[PDB]
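PT: before anyone asks, these are the final sequences, not the draft ones from last week. 748 residues across everything. Please model them as a single complex and drop the result in this thread when it's through.
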Amino acid sequence: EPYIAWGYPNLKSVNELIYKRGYGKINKKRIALTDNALIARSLGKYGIICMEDLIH
Amino acid sequence: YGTWRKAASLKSNYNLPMHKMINTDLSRILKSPEIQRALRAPRKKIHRRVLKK
Amino acid sequence: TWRRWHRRVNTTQKRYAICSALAASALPALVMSKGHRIEEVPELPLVVEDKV
Amino acid sequence: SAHLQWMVVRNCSSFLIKRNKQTYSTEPNNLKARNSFRYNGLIHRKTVGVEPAADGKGVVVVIKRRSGQRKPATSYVRTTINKNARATLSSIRHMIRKNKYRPDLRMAAIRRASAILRSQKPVMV
Amino acid sequence: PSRLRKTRKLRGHVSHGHGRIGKHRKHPGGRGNAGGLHHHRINFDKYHPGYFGKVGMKHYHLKRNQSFCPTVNLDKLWTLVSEQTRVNAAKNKTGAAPIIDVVRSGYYKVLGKGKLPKQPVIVKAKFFSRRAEEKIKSVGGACVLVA
Amino acid sequence: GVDIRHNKDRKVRRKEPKSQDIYLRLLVKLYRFLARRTNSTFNQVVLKRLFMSRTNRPPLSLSRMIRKMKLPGRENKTAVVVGTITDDVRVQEVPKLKVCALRVTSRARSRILRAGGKILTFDQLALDSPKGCGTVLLSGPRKGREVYRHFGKAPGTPHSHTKPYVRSKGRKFERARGRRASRGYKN
Amino acid sequence: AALRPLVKPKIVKKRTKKFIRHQSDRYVKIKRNWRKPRGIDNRVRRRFKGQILMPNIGYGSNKKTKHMLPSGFRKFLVHNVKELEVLLMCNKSYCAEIAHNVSSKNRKAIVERAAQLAIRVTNPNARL
RNA sequence: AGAGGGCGUGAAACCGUUAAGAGGUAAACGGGUGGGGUCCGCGCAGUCCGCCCGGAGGAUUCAACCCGGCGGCGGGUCCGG
RNA sequence: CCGACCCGUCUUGAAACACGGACCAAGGAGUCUAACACGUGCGCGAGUCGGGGGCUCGCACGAAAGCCGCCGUGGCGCAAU
RNA sequence: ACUAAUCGAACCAUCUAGUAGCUGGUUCCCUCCGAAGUUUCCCUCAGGAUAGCUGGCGCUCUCGCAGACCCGAGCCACGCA
RNA sequence: CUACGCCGCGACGAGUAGGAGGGCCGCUGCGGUGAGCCUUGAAGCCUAGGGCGCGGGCCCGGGUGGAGCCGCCGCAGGUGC
Ligand SMILES: [Mg+2]
Ligand SMILES: [Mg+2]
Ligand SMILES: [Mg+2]
Ligand SMILES: [Mg+2]
Ligand SMILES: [Mg+2]
Ligand SMILES: [Mg+2]
Ligand SMILES: [Mg+2]
Ligand SMILES: [Mg+2]
Ligand SMILES: [Mg+2]
Ligand SMILES: [Mg+2]
Ligand SMILES: [Mg+2]
Ligand SMILES: [Mg+2]
Ligand SMILES: [Mg+2]
Ligand SMILES: [Mg+2]
Ligand SMILES: [Mg+2]
Ligand SMILES: [Mg+2]
Ligand SMILES: [Mg+2]
Ligand SMILES: [Mg+2]
Ligand SMILES: [Mg+2]
Ligand SMILES: [Mg+2]
Ligand SMILES: [Mg+2]
Ligand SMILES: [Mg+2]
Ligand SMILES: [Mg+2]
Ligand SMILES: [Mg+2]
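LR: through. Structure below.
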């Protein structure tokens, strides 16, 4: 608790965070989410194939 | 110094050393059809970093 | 004076090195890379008659 | 073999010059005069080289014949081209490309011939 | 080659790899195997148990030649003769068995490690072990002694 | 500042042979290309074995090779060892073996060839089976070295059977105190 | 006038001054050649503010423009005419320095041959 | 003899003189500029070079054929080796 | 203009009223032998090794290199208890 | 007290480069990793051995290496904290 | 495409004692090599001269000097204040 500030984000906060600063951990590398294929190749097996699916 | 079939007749115990690589022609080995059939296609496209707009 | 100036090498390794040197002396690229000016020698394993 | 001889002479050669963070090779048949497996003019079964002619006009294209690999006295064929620049470059292009005689040295030989001819033409004022 | 050693890399470092606090002094702890029972006792007990004390009977004027008795095992027994010998014995129609003289080959005792090929053989040795004799008999051979 | 620890950043492994053997380097080039451009894991294993040191490439005896190749289902397969095949004079019959090796002892080579066998270098193996199909990859006994009889728990500790370093073996050399109950203790 | 390089990028030097040895100003016995301070109390080694800066790898030049002369060429040292024909195909990126010990009558020939081969010499009028 | 009988070369410390600059927080130092100065850049009308178009000139000869020479590749082994 | 105490050293702690240091040049300190241990490279591999001796126009190099094999005696390894 | 400016054992040379757990010093650059002053034993307490903390060398495995540009086609690793 | 090479992506960067790697950092000598340099001027030294490298250092211009010297691949140290 003394080292963090936390709270309950809303839909707008989630959207801004994923769209402006969203980076994926693809092959242990910090890759910017500039395409939906990067999400699909790592999370498609779970039904997540786009930025919108990730945000949802 | 002997052949690889004969031992040396003037050294009483000596024979020529053996090759650990019979065919040293890397170009012909790699261009041989039996090597080429087993290979996956080359990935010759360079994927430079994408500026995160 | 007892610095151990001398080294002993295995006889098999010494023969190996002799074989390697002889084999290299028959390749024109290596003899040229030793700078020996063989551009008009008729045949690199150059053998002459016993009259010499 | 070419690869074996390259492993022998890639760092131990009397043609090797290592200076000023650069490396160079001064063997006779080295286009671009660089220390490299592709451009080495001694280790390959077929080589091509371009030199200035004996008199300062034209080029001499030397190619390595297939048969006498161990016979350096007859291993190289030298032909002198003393045409105009475009005809000379076309002749070298045809020797390398039509024969399929080391097609990876085509532009190196063409550029070296262009450099030699440009050096041979009289200076300006 | 002195050019490949640490001393060439320790130029400019004042302590030469021996520390500023404890330094490099002449002989801290003593010389040689000093204090093996007092202040190097843990090392001596840990890595060289049995170092201190006497065990057994001493014997003045030991002569190694008297007790010289090299040994050979049954698995290496057939290597003492030529390959021609073994193949001729194997393909021989009669029951004639070759003689292996381990004293001639330089061995005095035949030991029993390994197994023998199923073919008879006469073995001449100074000494035999019980299992070696049993195996030689088991393959139809014989053990004969020499002095 | 980032809260990470850097003492394990650099993985300690052979990326190339420490040897300067040009033939070994040439066939390292060959298997580097094969391991990169194939999906075969056999090529990867063989490449990383080629990098290895001599103590990590122990010799393989003819008897052990024969025993491993004698197992069911390994008929007409190529025995591959990244190292030296050694003659074993304790074996009497040698079967017909197709073997690839880095080195073969002269006597072992004579025995294999007299048995009707075939011996391949690693370039010939690359031509014969580029992906390593139909191969039995064998290794010599890695811990069959004298140093491993000294490695382990210290000799002067209970339940340790590790060989001590002694200049001589005899009744006077490290047998009294700490070795029997009659002299202090045993453990 | 002069021969121009193939490309002339903007050379950026992270540091232009030299790294002088600590306390080289206070003693003649201390040359300005850089020596790493290893004293226990050394404030330059400890990197206190306002002190003499220590060289480190972060000052390294861009690899594209490393070793370029201000003219954009990169320098190669030659001793006779034969060593000058290695630059025949490196013409547009490498220039030649005649070595300091080459005599005047020989460096004249080197200069003239380089003028023929369109090779740039950084000291073409050096013994005359 | 800017080699003159302890005389090849002739460094630093230290000193004399000349020249330039500066000077009440002991000098000295790091970073950033500014001023001056000595030099450097053949700086001082600013590059080149591939194709094409136009103008006005030269010249073997351009292609294609013929003869000869030499190479590269292919050939049931055409024939040997 | 801003920053900036003198280095070396022992020390929990040095700018210290702690010690050494006026300045400059040259010299100046983990070496060699033997024995171990482990790691790495090379050759041969159940073996390996001629190091002592001998044979080879005795000798510019050459005090080297080459060879011995019924010179492998021997050392170490192949068996321990 | 005095015994050649030397005396609670002169001077000279040698053994002798006597020994020192104590003081002082220990010579180029960059890069990577990076401590301990604690446990046990020691005529041990200004020191060692021992474990701990460190570095180096590795080795045995695990995830997948993907589509030649593109293009995933209940279930998603040995194990660890 | 000097495969001991070249290229791409991501994360990271304090450091004494200490350890390791790289050094186209430097000194002296040996085997090779540079058809290397040099009385049309070697080494050394001096320099408000031009530069290169993160750095150790190095190259070039000018002067002095007057006879020897250096690069590269290995080798060996009485090798860096
Ligand atoms: Mg340090
Ligand atoms: Mg202490
Ligand atoms: Mg760190
Ligand atoms: Mg700089
Ligand atoms: Mg100074
Ligand atoms: Mg401190
Ligand atoms: Mg004088
Ligand atoms: Mg003055
Ligand atoms: Mg002190
Ligand atoms: Mg105190
Ligand atoms: Mg201090
Ligand atoms: Mg005070
Ligand atoms: Mg005082
Ligand atoms: Mg004191
Ligand atoms: Mg004082
Ligand atoms: Mg003093
Ligand atoms: Mg000095
Ligand atoms: Mg001899
Ligand atoms: Mg014997
Ligand atoms: Mg006690
Ligand atoms: Mg103290
Ligand atoms: Mg950071
Ligand atoms: Mg660091
Ligand atoms: Mg010294």
